[PDB]
Design a protein around this ligand. Structure first.
Ligand code: MG
Ligand code: MG
Ligand code: MG
Ligand code: MG
Ligand code: MG
Ligand code: MG
Ligand code: MG
Ligand code: MG
Ligand code: MG
Ligand code: MG
Ligand code: MG
Ligand code: MG
Ligand code: MG
Ligand code: MG
Ligand code: MG
Ligand code: MG
Ligand code: MG
Ligand code: MG
Ligand code: MG
Ligand code: MG
Ligand code: MG
Ligand code: MG
Ligand code: MG
Ligand code: MG
Ligand code: MG
Ligand code: MG
Ligand code: MG
Ligand code: MG
Ligand code: MG
Lengths: 90, 87, 128, 200
RNA sequence: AAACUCAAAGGAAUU
RNA sequence: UGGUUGAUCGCGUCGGAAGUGUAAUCUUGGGGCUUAACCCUGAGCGUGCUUUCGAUACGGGUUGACUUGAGGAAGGUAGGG
RNA sequence: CAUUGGAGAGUUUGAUCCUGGCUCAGGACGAACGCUGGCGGCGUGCUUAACACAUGCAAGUCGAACGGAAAGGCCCUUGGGGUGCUCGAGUGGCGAACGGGUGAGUAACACGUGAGUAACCUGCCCUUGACUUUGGGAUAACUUCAGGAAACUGGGGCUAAUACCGGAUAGGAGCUCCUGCUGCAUGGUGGGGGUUGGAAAGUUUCGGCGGUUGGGGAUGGACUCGCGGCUUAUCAGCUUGUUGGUGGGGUAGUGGCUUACCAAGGCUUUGACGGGUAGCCGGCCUGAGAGGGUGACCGGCCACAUUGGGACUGAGAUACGGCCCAGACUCCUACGGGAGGCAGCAGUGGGGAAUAUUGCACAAUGGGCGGAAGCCUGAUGCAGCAACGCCGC
């Protein structure tokens, strides 16, 4: 019925990446790449960062292109959750 | 101390520490009583101990010895344990 | 508590205050939540500019004014709109008005007695 | 903080009449001192420095304040030399000189610093007071009968007042029609050379 | 590598 | 780092909008200290970031063609490899 | 469909051109030194020893919470009236976590910037809904006794509260069950039901001022995260609560934060780990710009308060002028034992090329407590000192 200010709006951060480690339970290490200019020489570089997500049911494998959404700290290092698998390269 | 306000404060801090320690120890004893009843597996004893412990947790939260969130967490644990025992 | 107070600025022996909103714990000349107005008391009929909408919002949300800001709000009439009281509400008198172009055109033409008191000072050197 | 020494020495060194005429500048073609008649090389720095020093000793301005004038002119939009000469002319002592109430800029500085003048109602004793447009400089009522003032009142007709000032001689009132332009400042230095100098 | 030391070391060409 | 080209995505790239980039400083317009330094005030700047809506020429991703780069087959062939 | 901006010189040769280093003209400074020195305005002033500190001050306030009466003050044959204002000491509330200082540590989500908390707490203040019920037992002060050189400590007796503790009554606190609408996974939210529970304080000069509890607001804080800013490979392996999982515990809160069990992960030549240096930034200086150097004043964040560790109280704690323990120091001692921390302001010694007064005032602005008059404020406003800078004469 009449709920409070709905929408919540406040959206969280989303990253598309490639799974580089699936060999720990309910966790996948995702490599996310971004392209930025070099601060001095202006070339468009490729910056890569490893993000640990939470994969309930262990649904993703090595080499799978996945989508992750940021969450509250789920462990000492996990801060993301798997939301879908885009390409199952296998 | 160098300030008479601070001397008054150390006296009152000691007094409040005695009060808070007594209340917290009573809370711990009640929760332990409930836990031992639950381990023994009794139903009536565990129910009575859970009621007592939850009431005392709320009383301490009202007295300000413990935070209301801490009282709620401990009450939730006790009630869930009692529900598991009943089931 | 959130306060509406004066933040001092300017030179030595020349203070200009910014009517600002900040909490009590913050230092006097520090970061402010919002700047509401300005208050130059050194000037003639002290300048008092207060943003009426913002000061009304902060009073209605519960900011506590300092006595100086209460005086300024009394003069601007905001202390009567909020917490309705029988006060004169003496909206600031203007600090008068000079002009330059009109005086220049007045004197360019003044001529006459300009050079006239001028030949009178010629008679003065005679007297000198 | 003010040059009090002889001015003919500086005029002779700089090669031009800094002020006045019909004087000891009959020895003009050579600078002062024992080594005055020798032939000179005159580098570009020499030339530039000569122009800058000519302006400085003409207007009675020392190096720090002249430099400040230079950055102000450089920041301002338009020709830097034009703006610099405009500032130097807008100085109040130069305004009194140009209006002709003083025999020389040194005399103008003397009277201004001694406070014989009113700027649009307010007493000013700052020789470097930059007069703005539509301003009214007035002789102090107490000092309307100074001997230099009466000499200027006797002599001003020969003197030429620039187009950007109106003077009520006998009244002691200098109306500033507008802030002067390069065509209105008398050409006696190379402001372009000064600008080039302040860039090395 | 560094301390230290020099105000040159050097390339091509000319007479 | 990438030959020619179709389609598509809109990450780079480009253009709006909103939010943010406190103040002071700084640039600049006004004003006050007798001028100046200095001070007050309006604006700009804050070279970014986030959100959102567009554009698709190029870079890139996905996908499909083409043979000229590249490699291979068949035949020919030189040599103190 | 234009620009606000860019200067060189000397020196290799017998001479030349090129390459090339070196040197210089410019600007700047929290500077020092030498010579010299008139004034004013506005700033700035221990960059080294986070070296050791004598002395004064830098945090108190409230009698409209309380018993009271050691002072002053009124009324009374000197004590006596607590009688009224007032008021030491004592309980109680609030403040003391702010303001102020320093830059030792820290190469780290510390900081800059932008977001997330459906993982958060928030005293005083504002707003709105309910309330403010019924009892009880002590204790400081005081009094007496004993001990101690002291710091002070322990008994006996006695006493009041808005101090403390039973009870009743109160949701949006626990558990649970229906049902509406929904998000970003854990979920959020509206409605109803069952069940177990959680408060309070009175006071006044009658003008006041307060108490408890829900829900919002504001304020402040907390954690998480993307991106960004040093050097070193003559540091190549690092890690075992380490990486993840499940149950429990803990916390305001998510979490190996903690624990038990299970698994063998996690990081790294795109530089992990180690070494060196360093608070970060808004800014400052320089520069045509791009950059380079820097992090004084001022402002924001962080860290620290004799060194190391620890918790306590609290809405809130690196708790500068708090507590506990240990170390190093200084002081008192009757030798039994005690007391202390200027990187608060001024100041001293010391080090150094080098940096100030043991000042005045709460008049202004800001802060704490009080209903208020008011009290406190080395914040601050000012003054002193020094050509240290800028500007003017
Ligand atoms: Mg026990
Ligand atoms: Mg729990
Ligand atoms: Mg291509
Ligand atoms: Mg295409
Ligand atoms: Mg400004
Ligand atoms: Mg002016
Ligand atoms: Mg700004
Ligand atoms: Mg492509
Ligand atoms: Mg073949
Ligand atoms: Mg040679
Ligand atoms: Mg030679
Ligand atoms: Mg008292
Ligand atoms: Mg601080
Ligand atoms: Mg600092
Ligand atoms: Mg109570
Ligand atoms: Mg980083
Ligand atoms: Mg767990
Ligand atoms: Mg350091
Ligand atoms: Mg830096
Ligand atoms: Mg600072
Ligand atoms: Mg606590
Ligand atoms: Mg303290
Ligand atoms: Mg503090
Ligand atoms: Mg101290
Ligand atoms: Mg000191
Ligand atoms: Mg010494
Ligand atoms: Mg005050
Ligand atoms: Mg008052
Ligand atoms: Mg005091």
């Amino acid at each position: 019925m009449s709920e409070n200010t709905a929408e919540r709006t406040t959206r969280r951060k989303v990253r598309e990446g490639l799974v580089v480690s699936d060999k720990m339970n309910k966790t996948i290490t995702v490599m996310v790449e971004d392209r930025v200019k070099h601060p001095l020489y202006g070339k468009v570089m490729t910056k890569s960062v490893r993000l640990k997500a939470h994969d309930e049911n262990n649904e993703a494998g090595m080499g799978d292109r996945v989508r992750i959404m940021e969450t509250r700290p789920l462990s000492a290092t996990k801060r993301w959750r798997l939301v879908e698998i885009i390409e199952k390269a296998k | 101390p160098n300030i008479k306000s601070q001397i008054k404060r150390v006296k009152t801090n000691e007094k409040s520490r005695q009060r808070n320690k007594a209340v917290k120890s009573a809370l711990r004893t009640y929760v332990r009583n409930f836990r031992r009843a639950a381990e023994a597996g009794d139903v009536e004893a565990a129910t009575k101990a859970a009621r007592v412990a939850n009431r005392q947790l709320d009383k301490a939260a009202s007295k300000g010895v413990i935070h209301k969130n801490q009282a709620a967490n401990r009450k939730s644990a006790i009630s869930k344990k009692l529900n598991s025992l009943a089931a | 508590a959130t306060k509406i107070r004066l933040k001092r600025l300017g030179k030595i022996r020349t203070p200009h205050y910014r009517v600002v909103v900040m909490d009590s714990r913050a230092k006097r000349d520090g970061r402010a939540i919002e700047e509401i107005g300005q208050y130059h008391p050194k000037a003639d009929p002290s300048v008092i500019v207060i943003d009426s909408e913002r000061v009304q919002y902060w009073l209605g949300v519960g900011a506590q004014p300092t006595e100086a800001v209460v005086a300024l709000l009394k003069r601007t009439g905001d202390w009567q709109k909020f917490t309705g009281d029988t006060s004169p509400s003496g909206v600031k008198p203007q600090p008068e008005r000079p002009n330059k172009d009109d005086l220049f055109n007045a004197a360019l033409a003044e001529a006459d007695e300009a050079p006239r008191e001028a030949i009178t000072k010629k008679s003065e050197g005679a007297a000198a | 903080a003010r040059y009090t020494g002889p001015l003919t020495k500086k005029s002779r060194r700089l090669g031009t009449d800094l002020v006045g005429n019909d004087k000891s500048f009959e020895r003009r073609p050579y600078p002062p001192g024992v080594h005055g008649r020798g032939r000179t090389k005159d580098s570009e720095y020499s030339l530039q420095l000569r122009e800058k020093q000519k302006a400085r000793y003409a207007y009675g301005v020392l190096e720090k304040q002249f430099r400040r004038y230079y950055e102000e002119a450089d920041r301002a939009q338009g020709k830097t030399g034009d703006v610099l000469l405009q500032i130097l002319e807008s100085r109040l002592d130069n305004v009194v000189y140009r209006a002709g109430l003083a025999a020389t800029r040194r005399q103008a500085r003397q009277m201004v610093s001694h406070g014989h003048f009113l700027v649009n109602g307010k007493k000013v004793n700052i020789p470097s007071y930059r007069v703005s447009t539509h301003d009214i400089i007035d002789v102090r009522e107490k000092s309307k009968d100074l001997p230099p003032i009466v000499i200027a009142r006797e002599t001003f007709e020969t003197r030429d007042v620039p187009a950007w000032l109106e003077v009520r001689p006998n009244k002691g009132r200098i109306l500033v029609h507008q802030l002067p332009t390069r065509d209105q400042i008398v050409i006696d230095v190379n402001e372009q050379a000064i600008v080039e100098l302040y860039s090395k």
